[PDB]
Write a protein that binds this DNA or RNA. Structure first.
Ligand SMILES: [Mg+2]
Ligand SMILES: [Mg+2]
Ligand SMILES: [Mg+2]
Ligand SMILES: [Mg+2]
Ligand SMILES: [Mg+2]
Ligand SMILES: [Mg+2]
Ligand SMILES: [Mg+2]
Ligand SMILES: [Mg+2]
Ligand SMILES: [Mg+2]
Ligand SMILES: [Mg+2]
Ligand SMILES: [Mg+2]
Ligand SMILES: [Mg+2]
Ligand SMILES: [Mg+2]
Ligand SMILES: [Mg+2]
Ligand SMILES: [Mg+2]
Ligand SMILES: [Mg+2]
Ligand SMILES: [Mg+2]
Ligand SMILES: [Mg+2]
Ligand SMILES: [Mg+2]
Ligand SMILES: [Mg+2]
Ligand SMILES: [Mg+2]
Ligand SMILES: [Mg+2]
Ligand SMILES: [Mg+2]
Ligand SMILES: [Mg+2]
Ligand SMILES: [Mg+2]
Ligand SMILES: [Mg+2]
Ligand SMILES: [Mg+2]
Ligand SMILES: [Mg+2]
Ligand SMILES: [Mg+2]
Ligand SMILES: [Mg+2]
Ligand SMILES: [Mg+2]
Ligand SMILES: [Mg+2]
Ligand SMILES: [Mg+2]
Ligand SMILES: [Mg+2]
Ligand SMILES: [Mg+2]
Ligand SMILES: [Mg+2]
Ligand SMILES: [Mg+2]
Ligand SMILES: [Mg+2]
Ligand SMILES: [Mg+2]
Ligand SMILES: [Mg+2]
Ligand SMILES: [Mg+2]
Ligand SMILES: [Mg+2]
Ligand SMILES: [Mg+2]
Ligand SMILES: [Mg+2]
Ligand SMILES: [Mg+2]
Ligand SMILES: [Mg+2]
Ligand SMILES: [Mg+2]
Ligand SMILES: [Mg+2]
Ligand SMILES: [Mg+2]
Ligand SMILES: [Mg+2]
Ligand SMILES: [Mg+2]
Ligand SMILES: [Mg+2]
Ligand SMILES: [Mg+2]
Ligand SMILES: [Mg+2]
Ligand SMILES: [Mg+2]
Ligand SMILES: [Mg+2]
Ligand SMILES: [Mg+2]
Ligand SMILES: [Mg+2]
Ligand SMILES: [Mg+2]
Ligand SMILES: [Mg+2]
Ligand SMILES: [Mg+2]
Ligand SMILES: [Mg+2]
Ligand SMILES: [Mg+2]
Ligand SMILES: [Mg+2]
Ligand SMILES: [Mg+2]
Ligand SMILES: [Mg+2]
Ligand SMILES: [Mg+2]
Ligand SMILES: [Mg+2]
Ligand SMILES: [Mg+2]
Ligand SMILES: [Mg+2]
Ligand SMILES: [Mg+2]
Ligand SMILES: [Mg+2]
Ligand SMILES: [Mg+2]
Lengths: 183, 386, 63, 109
RNA sequence: GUGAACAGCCUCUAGUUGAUAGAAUAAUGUAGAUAAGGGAAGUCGGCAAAAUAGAUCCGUAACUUCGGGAUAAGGAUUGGC
RNA sequence: CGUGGAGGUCAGUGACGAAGCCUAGACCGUAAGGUCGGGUCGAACGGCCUCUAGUGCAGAUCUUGGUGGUAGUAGCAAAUAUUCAAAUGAGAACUUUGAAGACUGAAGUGGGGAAAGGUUCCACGUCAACAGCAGUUGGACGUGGGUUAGUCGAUCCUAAGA
RNA sequence: GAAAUUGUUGAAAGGGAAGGGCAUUUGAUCAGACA
């Protein structure tokens, strides 16, 4: 443990990891973000469809000179793609969280994903041969992935401060007479 | 430093941007000047470009080497079933220009128009105009005061009409609706005419007559992304040249340090709006009329539809407008025909043609016969047949 | 399941090119156990591996 | 529900292949057929008999016959349970000429 | 086998079927072709390209160190049975 | 003003937390900087008078190391070509087998050798890296097995030369 | 276990760069002095 900042109550949450996964950091960033906050159940059906090319993943940061597709209109976006290998890695972590939730005794029907965070694993070095006797790095850009599923809880009641009110002699001359005067 | 030799630029800058049009239905940007001394009638019409054929006629032009000699001439045919009137809209003048004030609609509306108001017709509850239709019920009250208010204000009146696209061999069930300015005399006389024609139908013959000069408004054929050489009619560069030759060698001087609006670049080609003018009407067809394609001199009963039928269109079973020459837009496209904006004198305009013979052989190859009858005649008996 | 070795062995034992050895796809478990020449031998002799015929180059048109 | 049928279709390969690169004509045909079975049987799963394959490749890559008489059979799936309980086998029918036949139901038992 | 032929093209024996893949077929390309009428007007320049071509027969100029020049040039012809 | 180290001193601070690091929290100084709080941490460290220098960085196409934008972009297009089905396996466009379609066309993509390599041969196991997609396959990884001479070479002889 | 550089969360601003100076509104935040 020690995940990234979460704000969720661990008593109603379960969680999962991959570290050093050989998936593209950038693609799986975009798909992770696409699932983020979703009903765990709506999220899984969703990734399934991506894999079917029936809906897509909006690319929002790492996306310059990406293609264009109708399947982004859903999301207000023109550039969206269908990152297979990301999706399968992510849904694998999701499947894991599920299992752990089941184990903690949490109600599945309330599970939404309340944290999903990819960042950059150590790079993996391979190399390519360029013209005129030269050599260049040829590099894997892998990812750590972490997610957290949590049971939805409704409402929040109320309750907070009181702000101790403070007003001059003349400020309560008005008031003391505001009611003595009228109602 | 200075050209060296001089040539005209390439292509016309009064047609920019060379962009795809906003719609398949090119817009009537202008109507005939209005003379309110004449009876009320439309000033344009809707139809579909079916095809072309050939014509033979004696030409009448004292002075020419072809006076009283036959000529053979290309004509297009546009399919033109009666348009149907479903609304009136009244415009008023403002220091900001012409502004629409109300629209009054007919009570019943064909599914054909009704389905232009939709994008997913099948799935829908088709509730379009159903509260409106109720406005008649109550004696009439509201529709009156609207007609009535058009009457009171309003500098111009247009009619809302639409095509009967089902009377047409096309697949698309969804019809074309459009405003036609109405020029016959007097604002009030106009809207009465409009009120009267709600749900009722209007013919071509009430709009065009033989030998009339008319204009065609349409969206040009599409060609997609186009290199500079064909799109602007630029010179091919020499065969020896590196990294390609259908280009422009100098896209610009060093200063202004900016490619300029006025130089030819690759881009979309076609699918443009055009307003082509001065197309004389050689024929006004009649759907109920056998011997459409016959003439005084031909006589042989046959309709304009070529053997095998208009390639890539179908049959023409409605009335039609036969117009000398060729027209913007392609087969199957909606096309607006417009009354001319000036009284041309020309001699060319004014010449009253009379067709001698309309061609009617197949267009799907080197057609050899006008009619199954002719073909039966010439060929004799075949291994099928009786 | 991986019959390369058995196939090559087959070619060699029967005395012809691999391009013409037939490995019977239903005795695929039986064939696999055949690690040796003596047991490819008596796999050839009972039809689990057959020689597969020459491809005719007829001379009739020449003639 | 399901329905479990056999019919025998003729498919125009000629207009489906018109244009296609020569080195892709037999491959395209394999595909386009599959597609044809799905359009008729509803079924995402389409399987071609090894003899059907032969009929297609009978004259080399670019030499695919302009019309094929297929027999498409819808069947129920088996083992490890695929996405959908149905699937289609396609077989060649030994016909004298594929030219001229309407589409016909095979009464099966 | 064709053919003068260890050529090109097709085949038997043997050996392969390796070389990211899918969908489309915009511009501009790279590589492969065609184009009416004109015919180098293009261009520093016929660059590129096109034309020619095997064999049998006929015919073959200046000039020459008499050996050549020479497949000079120019022509006809050619399948099957 | 600040840093390494030295003499003296405050019987200086410290595992009840030294040093370091983090902190749009506090305070002193015109400034170099100095002080505190809180978090993190784990074994040493500071004030004052003096002594001493390998003593203060933004640059030097500076040295070494690490990291970006570029960018999921250029690209992965020469060598005619692939296809159906079964089998296996968590997993099969790519493995195995069967079938079909082609290719090299004996101036070979066939069958052997010389130089050079050095175990790559063969078998069983097997996928983390590697084979610029993949992988259940491999000239990869693991563990083993394998090269038999009186006649084949060396060895003997001489060559240019040493 | 600093920095460059990165992910998530919170807050804020953004009509062809951003960053800076004097000044004040607004929001957030906080020292001190009083007794
Ligand atoms: Mg980690
Ligand atoms: Mg980016
Ligand atoms: Mg970025
Ligand atoms: Mg792009
Ligand atoms: Mg690009
Ligand atoms: Mg860009
Ligand atoms: Mg699509
Ligand atoms: Mg966008
Ligand atoms: Mg590279
Ligand atoms: Mg390279
Ligand atoms: Mg080199
Ligand atoms: Mg107070
Ligand atoms: Mg008061
Ligand atoms: Mg000038
Ligand atoms: Mg638009
Ligand atoms: Mg109003
Ligand atoms: Mg072109
Ligand atoms: Mg031109
Ligand atoms: Mg033109
Ligand atoms: Mg060049
Ligand atoms: Mg030019
Ligand atoms: Mg034609
Ligand atoms: Mg084509
Ligand atoms: Mg070999
Ligand atoms: Mg390659
Ligand atoms: Mg491709
Ligand atoms: Mg020419
Ligand atoms: Mg000539
Ligand atoms: Mg010249
Ligand atoms: Mg000349
Ligand atoms: Mg010149
Ligand atoms: Mg020169
Ligand atoms: Mg010159
Ligand atoms: Mg040349
Ligand atoms: Mg020629
Ligand atoms: Mg000469
Ligand atoms: Mg003869
Ligand atoms: Mg000092
Ligand atoms: Mg010091
Ligand atoms: Mg020192
Ligand atoms: Mg303080
Ligand atoms: Mg502390
Ligand atoms: Mg400390
Ligand atoms: Mg310690
Ligand atoms: Mg000192
Ligand atoms: Mg120094
Ligand atoms: Mg400095
Ligand atoms: Mg520095
Ligand atoms: Mg610097
Ligand atoms: Mg400096
Ligand atoms: Mg530096
Ligand atoms: Mg570097
Ligand atoms: Mg990628
Ligand atoms: Mg790319
Ligand atoms: Mg290629
Ligand atoms: Mg390349
Ligand atoms: Mg392959
Ligand atoms: Mg060959
Ligand atoms: Mg050869
Ligand atoms: Mg090879
Ligand atoms: Mg060897
Ligand atoms: Mg070696
Ligand atoms: Mg091996
Ligand atoms: Mg692996
Ligand atoms: Mg390797
Ligand atoms: Mg790889
Ligand atoms: Mg791998
Ligand atoms: Mg080994
Ligand atoms: Mg070993
Ligand atoms: Mg010897
Ligand atoms: Mg010896
Ligand atoms: Mg550590
Ligand atoms: Mg300020």
């Amino acid at each position: 443990a020690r995940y990234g900042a979460t704000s969720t109550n661990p008593a109603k949450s379960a969680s999962a990891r991959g570290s050093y996964l050989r998936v593209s950091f950038k693609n799986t960033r975009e798909t992770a973000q696409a699932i983020n906050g979703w009903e765990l159940t709506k999220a899984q059906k969703y990734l399934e469809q991506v894999l079917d090319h029936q809906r897509a993943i909006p690319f929002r940061r790492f996306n310059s000179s990406i293609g264009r597709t109708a399947q982004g209109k859903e999301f207000g976006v023109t550039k969206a793609r269908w990152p297979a290998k990301s999706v399968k890695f992510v849904q694998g972590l999701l499947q894991n969280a599920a299992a752990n939730a089941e184990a903690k005794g949490l109600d599945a029907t309330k599970l939404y994903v309340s944290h999903i965070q990819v960042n950059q694993a150590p790079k993996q070095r391979r190399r390519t041969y360029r013209a005129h006797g030269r050599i260049n790095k040829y590099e894997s850009s892998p990812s750590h992935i972490e997610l957290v599923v949590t049971e939805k809880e409704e409402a929040v009641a109320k309750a907070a401060e009181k702000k101790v009110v403070r007003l001059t002699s003349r400020q309560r001359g008005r008031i003391a007479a505001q009611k003595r005067i009228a109602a | 430093s200075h050209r060296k030799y001089e040539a005209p630029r390439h292509g016309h800058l009064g047609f920019l941007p060379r962009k795809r049009a906003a719609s398949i239905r090119a817009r009537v940007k202008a109507f005939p000047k209005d003379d309110r001394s004449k009876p009320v009638a439309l000033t344009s019409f809707l139809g579909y470009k079916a095809g072309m054929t050939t014509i033979v006629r004696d030409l009448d032009r004292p002075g020419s080497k072809f006076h009283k000699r036959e000529v053979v001439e290309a004509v297009t045919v546009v399919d033109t079933p009666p348009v149907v009137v479903v609304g009136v809209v009244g415009y008023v003048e403002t220091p900001r220009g012409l502004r629409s004030l109300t629209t009054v609609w007919a009570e019943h509306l064909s599914d054909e128009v009704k389905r232009r108001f939709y994008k997913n017709w099948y799935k829908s509850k088709k509730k379009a105009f159903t509260k409106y239709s109720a406005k008649y019920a109550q004696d009439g009250a509201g529709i009156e005061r609207e007609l009535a208010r058009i009457k009171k204000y309003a500098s111009v009146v247009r009619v809302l009409v639409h095509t009967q696209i089902r009377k047409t061999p096309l697949a698309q069930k969804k019809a074309h609706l459009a405003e036609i300015q109405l020029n016959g005399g007097s604002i009030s006389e106009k809207v009465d005419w409009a009120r009267e024609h709600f749900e009722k139908t209007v013919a071509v013959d009430s709009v065009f007559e033989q030998n009339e000069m008319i204009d065609a408004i349409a969206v040009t054929k599409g060609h997609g992304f186009e290199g500079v050489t064909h799109r602007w009619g630029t010179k091919k560069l020499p065969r020896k040249t590196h990294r390609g030759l259908r280009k422009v060698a100098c896209i610009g001087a060093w200063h202004p340090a900016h490619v300029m609006w006025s130089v030819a670049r690759a881009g979309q080609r076609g699918y443009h709006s055009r307003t082509s003018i001065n197309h004389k009407i050689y024929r006004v067809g009649k759907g109920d009329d056998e011997a459409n394609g016959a003439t005084s001199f031909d006589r042989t009963k046959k309709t304009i539809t070529p053997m095998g039928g208009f390639v890539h269109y179908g049959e023409i079973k409605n009335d039609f407008i036969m117009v000398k020459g060729c027209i913007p837009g392609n087969r199957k496209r909606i096309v607006t025909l417009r009354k001319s904006l000036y009284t041309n004198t020309s001699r060319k305009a004014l010449e009253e043609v009379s067709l001698k013979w309309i061609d009617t052989a197949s267009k799907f190859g080197k057609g050899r016969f006008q009619t199954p009858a002719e073909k039966h005649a010439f060929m004799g008996t075949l291994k099928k047949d009786l | 399941a991986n019959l390369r070795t058995q196939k090559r062995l087959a070619a060699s034992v029967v005395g012809v090119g691999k391009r013409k050895v037939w490995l019977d796809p239903n005795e695929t478990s039986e064939i696999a156990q055949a690690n040796s020449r003596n047991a490819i031998r008596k796999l050839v002799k009972n039809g689990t591996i057959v020689k597969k015929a020459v491809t005719v180059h007829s001379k009739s048109r020449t003639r | 529900l399901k329905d479990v049928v056999t019919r025998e279709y003729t498919i125009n390969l000629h207009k489906r292949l018109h244009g296609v690169s020569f080195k892709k004509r037999a491959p395209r045909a394999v595909k386009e057929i599959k597609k044809f079975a799905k359009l008729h049987m509803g079924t995402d799963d389409v399987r071609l008999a090894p003899e059907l394959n032969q009929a297609i490749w009978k004259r080399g890559v670019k030499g695919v016959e302009y019309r094929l008489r297929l027999r498409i059979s819808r069947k129920r799936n088996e083992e490890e349970d695929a996405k959908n309980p149905l699937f289609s086998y396609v077989e060649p029918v030994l016909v004298a000429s594929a030219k001229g036949l309407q589409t016909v139901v095979v009464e099966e038992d």
